[PDB]
Structures are given as structure tokens and as C-alpha cells.
Amino acid sequence: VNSFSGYLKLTDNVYIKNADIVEEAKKVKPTVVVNAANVYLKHGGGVAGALNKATNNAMQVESDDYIATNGPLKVGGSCVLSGHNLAKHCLHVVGPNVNKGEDIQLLKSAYENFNQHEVLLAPLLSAGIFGADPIHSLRVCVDTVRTNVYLAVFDKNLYDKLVSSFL
Ligand SMILES: CC[C@@H](O)[C@H]1CCCN1c1ncnc2[nH]ccc12
Ligand SMILES: [Cl-]
């Protein structure tokens, strides 16, 4: 039993809700929140900008030190950093950016990072400004993640479309 509330069940392990991930994180304070990061951990907009803003820029300060030490992440890769005031940990995951020509096949690699954590609050990856189709991203999520994932979908119209077309 966990404290996530109001989710629709898609499969044994995947749950979905029309919600702002920032609000879900503040309310639930989960063990792991997933950020839809870029390789530079520059949290400018979308999920990352909103999460970082909610930490009063502490996420960005921590991230800049991470990059100065370790260099950029790989597309498809991840790192575990603090969740600040939103969660115990933040799993920063880089999906491919199709508007940059990056291989959409790397989206499966991105979701594989979720399997290192028993339970996560997450967005779909590679959608938003990363350019990919959210319907495809959900299929990859369901077919890749085996741990318990609670998906927060910001746009109500998209949520309704994802849950009406789900196979
Ligand atoms: C389908 C993927 C989409 O849901 C992602 C990509 C764009 C923004 N978005 C968000 N998701 C959840 N919570 C959010 N809070 C602020 C933004 C946001
Ligand atoms: Cl985004």
C-alpha cells in the first residue's frame, strides 16, 4: 500500500493520472520523482523547469556541481540526485530529443532506468518539447518498466486520449 490516490490502473505495474507532477510530488513526497532532463541538467522548462522552480533553484545548483564533476549524461541515461523538498530522491532521466535528431529507440533505454527503483512518480518521457508522440512513449513505458510507476500527465486532453486508445 502507498499514498498515491486517484490513479487509473493500466497494467499490473503502471498507473496514470491527469496531474501536474510538481503538485503530486509536493502532496505525496514520494521516494523517487523522475525528472525529464537533458544531458546538461539545464532545467529550463517543462517538467524540469517546473520541478527546479519548486525547489527554489536548489535542484539547478546541485545539478551544476554534478555536471562540473562528472560531465554530461548520455541520451538514454540517468543519475540519482536529491529530491529536495519534493521527494527523497530525483531520478534525472534523459529521453531522446527527436527535434535534435536523436534516435527514438533510445526512449526504451531511458525507461530502463526506472527498473532500478521499486516505485516512482514520473512523467512520460521524450514528449513535451522533446518532440515525441506521447502515445508512443506510453506504449514504450508499459512495455519496458516492470517496477511500479505512477504517471502524471499534465494535459487533460492528452490524458483522455492516452487512456481511451490504450491497448
Ligand atoms: C506527456 C508528457 C507531459 O505530461 C510533460 C512534458 C511537458 C510537460 N509535462 C508535464 N507533465 C507532468 N507534470 C508537469 N508539470 C509541469 C509540466 C508537466
Ligand atoms: Cl518537458
Give the DSSP per-residue string, 33-64: EEEE--TT----SHHHHHHHHHTTTHHHHHHH
Question: Among all ligands shown, which has an atom nearest to the Cα of 95?
Answer: 2
DSSP3 helix / strand / coil % (the chain, rounded to 5):
40, 20, 40
Report the alpha-carbon angle 141-44-74, nearest 5: 50
- The fourth-level CATH superfamily of domain 8-163 is Leucine Aminopeptidase, subunit E, domain 1 (3.40.220.10)
**Residue 132: all three cell numbers together:** 515525441
Specify the 3-state DSSP secondary structure of 50. helix
The preferred substitution site among 28, 35, 47, 153 for testing ligand 1, maximizing ligand atoms within 8 Å of CB, is: 47
Specify the 3-state DSSP secondary structure of 122. strand
Q: List CB contacts of 99: < 8 A, sequence separation 6 or more.
A: 129, 130, 131
CA separation for the pair 84, 81 (Å, rounded): 9
Q: List CB contacts of 56: < 8 A, sequence separation 6 or more.
A: none
CA separation for the pair 41, 73 (Å, rounded): 8
Index of the ligand 1 atom closest to the CA of residue 155? 4
Rounded alpha-carbon distances, angstroms, from residue 35 to 3, 20, 140, 155: 20, 12, 17, 17
Are 61 and 43 in contact by the 8 Å Cβ rule? The answer is: no
Cα–Cα nearest to 99, from 129, 122, 59, 134:
129
133 Cα: distance to centroid of ligand 1 (angstroms): 13
CA separation for the pair 119, 96 (Å, rounded): 23
- Give residues (CB < 6 A) around ligand 1: 20-22, 46-47, 50, 123-124, 127-128, 134, 152-154, 158
CA separation for the pair 140, 83 (Å, rounded): 25
Q: For 81-118, b where at least 16 C-beta lie within 10 A, e where not — what string? A: bebbebbebbbbbbbbbbeeebebebbebbbbbbeebe
Question: Among all ligands shown, which has an atom nearest to the Cα of 121?
Answer: 1
Checking DSSP bridges between strand 8-9 and strand 14-18, what pairing results, if any?
A: antiparallel
The residue extents of the domains of the chain are 8-163
